[PDB]
Amino acid sequence: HGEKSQAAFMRMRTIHWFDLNWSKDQVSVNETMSISGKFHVFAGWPETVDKPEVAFLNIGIPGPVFIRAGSWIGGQLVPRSVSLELGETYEFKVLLKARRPGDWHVHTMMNVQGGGPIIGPGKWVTITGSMGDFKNPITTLTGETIDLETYALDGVYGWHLFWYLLGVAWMVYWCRKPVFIPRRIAVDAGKADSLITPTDKKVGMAFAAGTLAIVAVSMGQANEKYPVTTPLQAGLMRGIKSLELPQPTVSVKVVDASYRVPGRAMQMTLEITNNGDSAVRLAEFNTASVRFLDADVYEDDTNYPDDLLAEEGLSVSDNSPLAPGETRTVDVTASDAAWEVYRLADLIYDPDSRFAGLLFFIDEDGNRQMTMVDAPLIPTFI
Amino acid sequence: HGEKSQAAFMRMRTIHWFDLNWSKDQVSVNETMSISGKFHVFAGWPETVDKPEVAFLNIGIPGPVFIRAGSWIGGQLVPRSVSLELGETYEFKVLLKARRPGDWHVHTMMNVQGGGPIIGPGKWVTITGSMGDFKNPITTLTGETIDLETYALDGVYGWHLFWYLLGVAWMVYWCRKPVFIPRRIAVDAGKADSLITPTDKKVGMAFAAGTLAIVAVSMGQANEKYPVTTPLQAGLMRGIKSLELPQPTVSVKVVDASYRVPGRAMQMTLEITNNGDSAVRLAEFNTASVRFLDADVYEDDTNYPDDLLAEEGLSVSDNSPLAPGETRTVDVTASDAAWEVYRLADLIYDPDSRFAGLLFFIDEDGNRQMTMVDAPLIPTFI
Amino acid sequence: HGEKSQAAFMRMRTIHWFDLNWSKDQVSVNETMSISGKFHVFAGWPETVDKPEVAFLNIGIPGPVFIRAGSWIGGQLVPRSVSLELGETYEFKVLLKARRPGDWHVHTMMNVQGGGPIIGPGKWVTITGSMGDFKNPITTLTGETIDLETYALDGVYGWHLFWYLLGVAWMVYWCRKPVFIPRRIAVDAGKADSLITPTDKKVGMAFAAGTLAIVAVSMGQANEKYPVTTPLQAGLMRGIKSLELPQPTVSVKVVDASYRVPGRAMQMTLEITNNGDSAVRLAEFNTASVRFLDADVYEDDTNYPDDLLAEEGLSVSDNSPLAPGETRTVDVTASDAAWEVYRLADLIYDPDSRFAGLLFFIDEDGNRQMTMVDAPLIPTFI
Amino acid sequence: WTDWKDRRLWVTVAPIVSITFPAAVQAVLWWRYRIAWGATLCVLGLLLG
Amino acid sequence: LAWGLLFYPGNWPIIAPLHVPVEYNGMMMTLADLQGYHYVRTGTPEYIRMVEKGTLRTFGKDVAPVSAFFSGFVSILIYFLWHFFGSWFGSEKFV
């Protein structure tokens, strides 16, 4: 949750999430699942959102109800932050493994340093079992096969309880005696050395020398039980490969776009030109993760979250086929309740009324080739 | 005016303005005119001039003697600031509509954030009529057809005169009575409460409650006479298309360049190589908006400002034709008074004696294809 | 010297120096030498090293034991700082002319603003003679033919000795008389004007008016002996050409890489695919300027510094030829003492255990075409 | 977080910021009352919190 | 100096377990790194983290002792400052 509150134009003009696939939507504690797809980094990225030179592929969940066993961009593991570049289209996979039973609205997302959270679409996923089942095995480079959900936990609780009690000691060595009013009188009255006795004086040297001793030895005893340790691994991963993609089979031009305020729908006027070898029809308009579909061309095979699915949402004026060559100006209308649920209609409040989104065409074979649109978005008022 | 004062190398090594066209040079109040052309963003852009990630296409005029009815880069309206990129060549149009009669030296220009004003060439344009003729109609999205040169002006003068007089009131409610010496005495003498009486005390509550009342109502009465308002529209427009241009038909190499100090002329030694299908001749050298022309190849069809026009300015040593293939080292000399008028000769004072500019070749058909030169510029002294 | 102390991954993941050539390695005072080669700007440049938008091609020597008569990138003289760009491969030459006899470990290097010194490989070069032989002639644009190792040195020593002695004067005009205790008494006692007499008073006006006079005249006398002077020439040179290179004849993939800690060797598993017209064999692996060579394919013709030369260093599991088409997964092992001398093995301490380097293939003709590798580098422990 | 406990910054920041309040509480408790659990009252209070 | 030099020793026996390396999906990570990668911090993504990353002007380990000493020196300055601040704080003056 949380993205209906973000400016509408941000979510339209930032990162476009498409072709998402969720490999399950119910899972048992330790059973892994897979979210994979593509995303586009819209070349007209907002001013007040730093270009994504330093971005991180997160997932949105309330605490680690899953763990992120893996995440890839371009078939590279991306545990660190990456450089993405405006214009490019990337593919991604995240490997989630379940941990805490419940009903979780899992978002795939992209943190952009100097930008904010760029939040992709979420689908409810349900975990069943008892979280006490959760196990996170790792084979170290010294192997040794540990469970990272509990490893070294007896050492932390040990050493912290020791030093705390060592502290409580020092404080009770003294609060045995009277602390405040009598010591006060004693000091004021010129008699402050009377209050640190020589037993006092190096009971003190015990604790001191003890703490240093207990440090130096258990120090040395740690570089024995673990003789190979490496520093934390850190730093930006720049060379992230993308798709650079078949440059569009279809060439779309938004001659004008608009929306009715109030209203649940957006209307474009496209001039469309097929440069492939087969004929195409307009299957989908996809803005802000809402998928407007023409039911007479496309059915969703991906279990897209239904609150973003408009299964009969896209209404193309003259949606006949379109053979190679041949241009046609068309009238599109993207209507659905998602346009108000997800407050895309709140664009009326944004300081930049411009939109961007994806257009999907299918040929009679079945190959979807995808084209990208962006233009102003002028409101109409009764 | 104003660009003869800028460093010469800046103006040579920054933005190159070429193929400008002025659709008039006399105009009547309300008659529009059009300045259009191309500009090049020199890839060797100076250090101390921020790369033009955030630039704005202005016009240079003393006050809105015109209004800027439109401006385009790449067939996109650019009311906001744009991203330009080093290396690229752009085309532009600005639609000026006249407002104030006079003799105006109109400059097309490019403000570069973190850089300065980059000033293109100006041509005198003369407006005739009475400025009182000027009318600036706009059809709003609620339409309503307003004149933006006076719209809402009675509301500003109204509300400002009200609140000012409301203020003068408060001050004369009191300066009726004696203000300083008697109130002073009164306060010093222990008697300060004697000076705020109970009439005083909430004459005060009148003005207070009144001002809040007059605010809340006229507030509510404004969201009625105008029930649809949108916030100011703002933010950088990154995806600005350019030409990416036929990569030069002719391949020029500056083997050496120089200038005589003092002197009115610049001398290059070019080795030139035609890779087209027809033959070419050197028509033009264009640096800092000065157009050096060889009169036996080119005549200016654009009414270039004559103080930057050198109609017989370019003197090519052996300017015979040049058929496909075939290389020839040539001796060029660009001489004219513009070189001292416009203080390009002041390069002797600049901390970077390097130049850049355009070269124009025409084939016998008539097609000008343009090539770009830049190299050091070594001075010669008697 | 000095680069064994830098993080190993930095030196692997930063700039790759290859195909270096040293035109001598003994030279006499005034005899010039030439270091030339290529370098690659690794596209996975470390986070904490500013991208090289502002870099400078230096040489590493203890003081000007040579002078740098020239340096070029892409056949452009680069006396100022340049812009390099991640991904690109550049060629370079530096023209060193010897000055001070001794045994000098000459490093070619690249200072990266916001980055650090990026240090290339050094070879001992020996200068013989007497440094008093050194002569640095220059023909000025007024010419005049000067020696820049001594020019204007009598003017500096002159004018500095004058003004210093002019100062010592002023101080001895007064320290003639008693300075402290008597002047103190004099001032305290109300008698401070007694200590500046009227001779005093404008002996003072002499020195004042003299210093101003000696300034204004010798000022005017300098703009005569040198009537043409220009300001220092300064500013970044952006448009630096690179090779953009035949895109690799061979397509290498590092399926896994590793190193034995402790140990003197690095091991990769490459899958290799020849897309040329002839057959190739793996000649060289080059990381951090260490050149691992397979002696049965390549002999070094360049006098590479022997502490970085592994002449039989690269041990390819199945290093048979490889005709066009055909893929083969191979087992490489780069072993040599350089891996511990030059503390590439200290990567165990770095916070990013990833490597990058060059791979060289030769066809039976003899043409080396070069391919670039980079992947993690996982340690193995006994 | 354990993956922030590094060798450069954590080693620098945590002592510097944490020695403050001890030095404040010592200043009063020690010299006004020869109380000698000044730093430890603080570090006890932190860790408990 | 005591306060700074002791800070990493007093903590190394606890964290050291988590500094054994791991060949996870092709990349070396410490177990600490694995914990960060695994237990999803939705509102604390990776680049926010300010840990050592290397320099071209730097030598690797030793990095911890050199930092510990620097922390020791700054810690004495912080201590002078914060003693006087404490004296100020322990003041029975009335206004």
Ligand SMILES: OC[C@H]1O[C@H](O[C@H]2[C@H](O)[C@@H](O)[C@H](OCCCCCC3CCCCC3)O[C@@H]2CO)[C@H](O)[C@@H](O)[C@@H]1O
């Ligand atoms: O049992 C005989 C002793 O008891 C009395 O003193 C007690 C006091 O009455 C008794 O209340 C006191 O308790 C000390 C601990 C109380 C606070 C404990 C801590 C709370 C947490 C952190 C620090 C302080 O310890 C003293 C000695 O142990 C008598 O007054 C003593 O003279 C006598 O030596």
Ligand SMILES: OC[C@H]1O[C@H](O[C@H]2[C@H](O)[C@@H](O)[C@H](OCCCCCC3CCCCC3)O[C@@H]2CO)[C@H](O)[C@@H](O)[C@@H]1O
């Ligand atoms: O007409 C009879 C009154 O006139 C005299 O007082 C005058 C004063 O003589 C008269 O000069 C005074 O003028 C007040 C306004 C003068 C300043 C006006 C403002 C200038 C601009 C912003 C604030 C002040 O107002 C008083 C009452 O209106 C008498 O002295 C009063 O006792 C009497 O009530």
Ligand SMILES: OC[C@H]1O[C@H](O[C@H]2[C@H](O)[C@@H](O)[C@H](OCCCCCC3CCCCC3)O[C@@H]2CO)[C@H](O)[C@@H](O)[C@@H]1O
């Ligand atoms: O020769 C006769 C004079 O000598 C004595 O004074 C000397 C002093 O004994 C003599 O020691 C003094 O020396 C002055 C220079 C000493 C410091 C020189 C400078 C060191 C470097 C920078 C400034 C000071 O100069 C005075 C006059 O020249 C007598 O006391 C004078 O009364 C008498 O006029």
Ligand SMILES: [Cu+2]
């Ligand atoms: Cu959600």
Ligand SMILES: [Cu+2]
């Ligand atoms: Cu002008």
Ligand SMILES: [Cu+2]
């Ligand atoms: Cu060296």
